[PDB]
Amino acid sequence: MRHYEIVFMVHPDQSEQVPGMIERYTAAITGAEGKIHRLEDWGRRQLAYPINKLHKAHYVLMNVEAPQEVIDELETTFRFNDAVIRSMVMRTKHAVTEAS
Amino acid sequence: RKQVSDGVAHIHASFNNTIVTITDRQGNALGWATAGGSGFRGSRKSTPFAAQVAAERCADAVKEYGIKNLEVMVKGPGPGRESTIRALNAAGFRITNITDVTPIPHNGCRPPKKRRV
Amino acid sequence: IKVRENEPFDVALRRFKRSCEKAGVLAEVRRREFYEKPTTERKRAKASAVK
Amino acid sequence: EIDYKDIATLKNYITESGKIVPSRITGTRAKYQRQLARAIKRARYLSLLPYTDRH
Amino acid sequence: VKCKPTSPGRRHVVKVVNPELHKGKPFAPLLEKNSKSGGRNNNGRITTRHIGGGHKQAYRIVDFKRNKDGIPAVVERLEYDPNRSANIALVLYKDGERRYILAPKGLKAGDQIQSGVDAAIKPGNTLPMRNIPVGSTVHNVEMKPGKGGQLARSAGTYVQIVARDGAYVTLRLRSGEMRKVEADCRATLGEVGNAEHMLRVLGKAGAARWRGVRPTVRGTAMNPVDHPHGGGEGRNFGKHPVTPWGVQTKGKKTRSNKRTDKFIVRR
RNA sequence: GUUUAUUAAAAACACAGCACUGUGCAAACACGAAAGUGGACGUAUACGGUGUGACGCCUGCCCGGUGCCGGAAGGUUAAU
RNA sequence: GGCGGCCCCCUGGACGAAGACUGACGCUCAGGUGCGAAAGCGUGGGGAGCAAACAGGAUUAGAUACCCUGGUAGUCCACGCCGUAAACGAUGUCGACUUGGAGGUUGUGCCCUUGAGGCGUGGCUUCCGGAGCUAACGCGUUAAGUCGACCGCCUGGGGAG
């Protein structure tokens, strides 16, 4: 229940794939019985560097009260996903529940 | 003979020489010249008079490709940092940007040590 | 590190990048770096500056 | 100032070279500055504090 | 030899410190499904493969193809094979059958053996590389995509799946890493079973090269009735190549079918 | 050791590691005119060159010449 | 010694505290136990960029050279005989030492927290203060001036590591 602040970057224009693909990431968190403090559609925002060439991403952030048994599974199912630009995980010093 | 309007000026400033290298708005060659190869080849070819003459002599050729304005791309400076910029603009090619991306280069690649010098 | 000039009569507004990135980055690196002996030297210099 | 909603209002402490200025200029208490330092860190790596001009 | 169990040679108390000392990998009888290898060279007639001495080949492990994919299985034993130094093991499949498989270092527990199109990523019989992740270890490789195992043995030859290379044309291996063969080939995972039997000398001799054969021992030295050299008096001293065919570098290949090697940096 | 019974009876040396080497595989070798049988029920840590001289250190150096070949900037000047 | 981003696991040391429970189970150590900067042995390699050797063009009173392109080893190390030299209060074990006063920092008790910290107060660290002690630089109580438990080293040139 570590309070994993996790930002993941998917492919920019797949606005119809992603609403369900968050359901295909949260599905690992509920399994754990772990729980979502915040969960943010950051949208088609631009990039700091030229990664995976379409100069934007579809950014998603969440703050999960979820155990260590999920995070190497999450890391895997972001990484094995050819639609995932980059993905990163911060944790603890309380929870965030306020949007960005 | 190209009517590109836009050029991209790789100003090799430099520590030993001066080569003002214009590519097009896409990335292939367009026009160029130098100090050392224009009549100077030795311990005398990077000088603030030479670095301005390199740019002016690059401009005498570059004119034929139909090109009015440019950016400046810095990826290896030296004597003199602003001299080759002023000298393309003097010779009428408008400097609308300076892109100072220049690789230092940073610690771990540790560039040539040479004589203690 | 990207900086316009406008109307470009060779304006020379390009000048403010001396603050660090263009100009300060040569403290370590020139041909060659310093390699040995620059680490306690940074804090040695703090004592020459008390004036 | 430990967390997000306040550091989007405190970008005044970024000097023009794109870096966080030494507090000599206002004079803050150590606890509060050392809080804001970690609020800034999470906003750096998450690009919610988008550090210097081109990024 | 730095792994465990390493099994070291004895103290200097006898002429044989090595060979291999491993307990727990010879068993009997030679179990129902088996066969042997035949006589001496007998090619018909003037034999071209030198020195011979060809008795006792002897028995070999009859399991090739190994295409039994998604029927799950479990592990009784592991053995040896002296033809390949290998870590070969007894795999009971839960339809109603026993096989002999080319398994890695300690694949027993009796474990969770199962393979195939999409169904598993586990320890797995023969597994299509197009269906599964990237990795260092691969082993089997059906040498062209329906033929059979390129490697019949787990002797350290790490053949390595690269990711998105050239439309499915993977592997990063030994003598030519642009071998370029399709991920429609089958893996098993993986290439380290018995390091120990091959990371050290077995002997000077041991049974592997005197009870049933002779190896090479001569070609150039003695009697000029063979090689291009060299008079006698212990002198030789000349220019003597491997005629008509060459030796210490030249290459031999021009054309052939497949012939996919593409860069082959040599040395 | 019983090894070239037949000059020596070893004062021959068959070991066995290995850098390089033959082949990305109808793999090298082809005995036979047609086998594809050795190697294979097998992969370049299987199998072959040319050898190795317990074991463990140790293999400085030195490219003038001649090997080994491998190449392509360019001249000698053939089928084409 | 010695690592520079952050994290999952084994979760070092600690060490700020309402206390509970036992009453010196203690300190400090030689032979040994672990650790062990430079280096050799590796056994198989992971085989950028730079640069000893490697290889020369060059500056030639000889360069057997330093350049400058090209150049490995050093980068680091699974694993383990590693002694070992510059890791100096030229210096352990420490309790009592209570003129002190000044900073640099860390945690924290108490304030109409109108406050730049006021009244406090240990720890981590440095500053550098009498009576003495005393050459000359000045060191001035935790510091060499008192008092001490030892596991020590200390046998003069040159004989030696």
Closest CA to E128 of E101, E168, E91: E168
Query: Can you read off the two tokens belonging to residue B49?
Result: 């008079």
CB E103 within 8 A of CB E189: no
What are the sequence ranges of the domains in chain C?
1-51
Which of D1, D2, D3 is the best substitution to test chain A (most A C-beta atoms within 10 A)? D3
Q: Which residues contact E151 (CB under 8 A, 6 or more apart)?
A: E102, E139, E140, E141, E157, E159, E191
Q: Which residues contact E119 (CB under 8 A, 6 or more apart)?
A: E70
Closest CA to E266 of E204, E177, E193, E200: E177
CA distance B85 to chain C (A): 8
CB E175 within 8 A of CB E265: no
Task: Residue B5: count other Cβ atoms within 10 Å of its Cβ.
Answer: 13
Query: Can you read off the two tokens belonging to residue D32?
Result: 């509060």
The three state secondary structure string of chain E is CCCCCCCCCCCCCCCCCCCCCCCCCCCCCCCCCCEECCCCCCCCCCCCCCCCCCCCCCEECCCCCCCCCCCCEEEEEECCECCCCECCEEEEECCCEEEEECCCCCCCCCCCECCCCCCCCCCCCCEEHHHCCCECCCCCCECCCCCCECCCCCECCCCCECCCCCCCCCCCCCCCCCCCCCCCCEECCCCECCCCCCCCCCCCCCHHHCCCCCCCCCCCCCCCCCCCCCCCCCCCCCCCCCCCCCCCCCCCCCCCCCCCCCCCCCC
Q: Which of A48, A90, A96 sits opposite D47 (nearest CB)?
A: A48
Q: Would the CB atoms of D17 and C19 count as touching at under 8 Å? A: yes
Domain extent, residue A6, equals 1-92
Q: Is the CB of A91 under 7 A from strand G?
A: yes
Element holding C45 (H helix, E strand): helix C39-48
CB A13 within 8 A of CB A44: yes
CB E19 within 8 A of CB E202: yes
Which chain A residue has its CA at the smallest distance from D48's CA? A100
Q: Would the CB atoms of A48 and D50 count as touching at under 8 Å? A: yes
Q: Which E residues 54-73 have CB within 7 Å of strand F?
A: 57, 60-65
Q: Would the CB atoms of B111 and C2 count as touching at under 8 Å? A: no
Q: Which residues from chain C sit within 8 angstroms of residue D54, using beta carbons?
A: 1-2
Which of D5, D46, D51 is the best substitution to test chain A (most A C-beta atoms within 10 A)? D46
Q: Is the peptide bond before E29 cis (omega within 30 degrees of 0)?
A: yes
Q: Which residues from chain D sit within 8 angstroms of residue C1, using beta carbons?
A: 54
CA distance B45 to chain C (A): 19
For residue A99, tell me if it sits in a domain. no
CA distance C12 to chain D (A): 18
Task: Residue D50: count other Cβ atoms within 10 Å of its Cβ.
Answer: 14
Distance from C-alpha of E151 to C-alpha of E158, rounded to nearest angstrom = 10
Query: Can you read off the two tokens belonging to residue E9?
Result: 């040679």
For residue A100, tell me if it sits in a domain. no
Q: Is the CB of E222 under 7 A from strand F?
A: yes
Q: Which residues from chain A sit within 8 angstroms of residue D3, using beta carbons?
A: 96, 98
Backbone Cα Rg of chain B: 15
Distance from C-alpha of A77 to C-alpha of A81, rounded to nearest angstrom = 6
Q: Tokens 């009697």, residue?
A: E223
Q: Would the CB atoms of C19 and D54 count as touching at under 8 Å? A: no
CA geometry: angle at B2 spanning B1 and B7, to 5°? 130
Closest CA to E134 of E162, E170, E167, E164: E162
Distance from C-alpha of B7 to C-alpha of B23, rounded to nearest angstrom = 6
The distance in angstroms from the start CA to the end CA of chain B is 47
CB E203 within 8 A of CB E18: yes
Task: Residue B72: count other Cβ atoms within 10 Å of its Cβ.
Answer: 23
Q: Any idea which nucleotide's C1' is nearest the CA of E35?
A: F41
Task: Residue B31: count other Cβ atoms within 10 Å of its Cβ.
Answer: 22
Q: Which of A49, A90, A98 sits opposite D42 (nearest CB)?
A: A90
CB E99 within 8 A of CB E91: yes
Q: Is C4 on the interface with D (CB under 8 A)?
A: no
Q: Would the CB atoms of D46 and A90 count as touching at under 8 Å? A: yes
Per DSSP, C37 falls in state S
Distance from C-alpha of E102 to C-alpha of E140, rounded to nearest angstrom = 8
**Quick check: helix, strand or coil at residue B54?**
helix
C47-CA/G139-C1' distance, Å = 25
Element holding A39 (H helix, E strand): strand A35-43
For residue A80, tell me if it sits in a domain. yes
Chains that touch B (3 or more CB pairs under 8 A): C
CB E160 within 8 A of CB E141: no
For residue A38, tell me if it sits in a domain. yes
Task: Give the total number of structural domains in chain A.
Answer: 1
Which of A7, A9, A38, A85 is the best substitution to test chain D (most D C-beta atoms within 10 A)? A7
Q: Is B112 on the interface with C (CB under 8 A)?
A: yes
Which bases of chain G are contacted by protein, using any atom under 7 A from a CB? Answer: 6-9, 43, 48-51, 66-70, 78-79, 106-107, 116-117
**Quick check: helix, strand or coil at residue D52?**
coil
Q: Is the CB of E235 under 7 A from strand F?
A: no
